[PDB]
Design an enzyme around this catalytic site. Structure first.
Site, short mmCIF file in Angstrom:
data_model
loop_
_atom_site.label_atom_id
_atom_site.label_comp_id
_atom_site.label_asym_id
_atom_site.label_seq_id
_atom_site.Cartn_x
_atom_site.Cartn_y
_atom_site.Cartn_z
N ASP A 109 -3.60 22.36 -47.97
CA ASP A 109 -2.87 21.69 -46.90
C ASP A 109 -1.75 22.60 -46.41
O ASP A 109 -0.67 22.65 -47.02
CB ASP A 109 -2.27 20.41 -47.45
CG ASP A 109 -1.53 19.63 -46.38
OD1 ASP A 109 -1.65 19.97 -45.21
OD2 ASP A 109 -0.84 18.64 -46.78
N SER B 166 1.51 27.12 -28.44
CA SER B 166 0.32 27.39 -27.64
C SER B 166 0.72 27.61 -26.18
O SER B 166 1.68 26.99 -25.70
CB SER B 166 -0.69 26.24 -27.76
OG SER B 166 -1.75 26.37 -26.89
#
Ligand SMILES: O=C(O)CCc1nccs1
Ligand code: NA
Length: 330
Positions: free
Chosen positions: A35, A199
């Protein structure tokens, strides 16, 4: 040193991935959920409340010649999905894919929440976010990566998740055979303890690319892609009959649909998520409503590039002094 381990989807939907991990001496092999959005290595154990164990493999520290109680240390964690676990702490030898760390904090669960109990395939979590998020008190502990990084050929790990197929986690090296083209690297902020990046925009299907900054985290422990409501609405508006349902918990769509792809920007590079990756199947067994793989992050307080996005790429988690993320197509 390096390590290389295969990671396998737990079910037909790629809801999560498990990777075998050796703990203790002689080895006890547990299947852990790696994770990158948390920083605790915790396991089902001989200490876990018996009614909260249903099929998991447990770690038994009393059977490991290298286990030692980390006296006075406790831990307690709550995840973004409302699940939780807590317990006490041992140090032991932990190996992943042939890479060994001695003295790793292995957090032994005394209590787990119902979702963990109900998932017989996951024997615990191995956190790969920054060690600033580790919940051990009073002495915070390091992640497996942070403890290994003294030793790795290159201070990196890579995630190469499969679509309905196994993939690979590598430690200490880039496998230049595992991706196509070049890796595009992008800046990371560690301010919240996550692999947080920005992004450069998105496109829906064969639509034009929208240049827009989208801060978010690269999180292998989250199944879906969670993005701002504007972006998500623009995606689902291209699917006939798609709607956001309050009762189901997100956007659903007709199972008879063909889904468009979704592209996200990494600098000047583009990663394309095929439409098929965004299908999470019937909302209940036999339904013709299907659950979407792109959902709104509104109310969650952060955008999350979970497995839907990451499994479209070869992803480099660069833990050098100045951390960075890299993405390549594959
Ligand atoms: O087709 C189904 O089983 C549910 C359709 C829905 N009704 C409301 C939300 S989703
Ligand atoms: Na679900």
């Amino acid at each position: 040193s390096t390590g290389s381990a295969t990671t396998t989807p737990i079910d037909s939907l790629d809801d999560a991935y498990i990777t075998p991990v050796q703990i203790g001496t002689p080895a006890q092999t547990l299947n852990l959920d790696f994770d990158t959005g948390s920083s605790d290595l915790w396991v089902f154990s001989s200490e876990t409340t018996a009614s909260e164990v249903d099929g998991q493999t447990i770690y038994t520290p009393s059977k490991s010649t290298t286990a030692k109680l980390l006296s006075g240390a406790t831990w307690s964690i709550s995840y973004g999905d409302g699940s939780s676990s807590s317990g006490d702490v041992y140090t032991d030898t932990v190996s992943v894919g042939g890479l060994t760390v001695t003295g790793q904090a292995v957090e032994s669960a005394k209590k787990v929440s119902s979702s963990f109990t109900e998932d017989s395939t996951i024997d615990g979590l191995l956190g790969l976010a920054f060690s600033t998020l580790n919940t051990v008190s009073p002495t915070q502990q390091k992640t497996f990566f942070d403890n290994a990084k003294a030793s790795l050929d290159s201070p990196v790990f890579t995630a190469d998740l499969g679509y309905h197929a196994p993939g690979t986690y590598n430690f200490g090296f880039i496998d230049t055979t595992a991706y196509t083209g070049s890796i595009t690297y992008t800046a990371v902020s560690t301010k919240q303890g996550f692999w947080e990046w920005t992004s450069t925009g998105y496109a829906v299907g064969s639509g034009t690319f929208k240049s827009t900054s989208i801060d978010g985290i690269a999180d292998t422990g989250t199944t879906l892609l969670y993005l701002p409501a504007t972006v998500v609405s623009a995606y689902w508006a291209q699917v006939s009959g798609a709607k956001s349902s309050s009762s189901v918990g997100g956007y659903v769509f007709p199972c008879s649909a063909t889904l468009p792809s979704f592209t996200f920007g990494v600098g000047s590079a583009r990663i394309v998520i095929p439409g098929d990756y965004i299908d999470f199947g019937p909302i209940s067994t036999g339904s013709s409503s299907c659950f979407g793989g792109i959902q709104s992050s509104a109310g969650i307080g952060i955008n999350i590039f979970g497995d839907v996005a990451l499994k479209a790429a070869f992803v480099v988690f660069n833990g050098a002094t100045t951390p960075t993320l890299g993405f390549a197509s594959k």
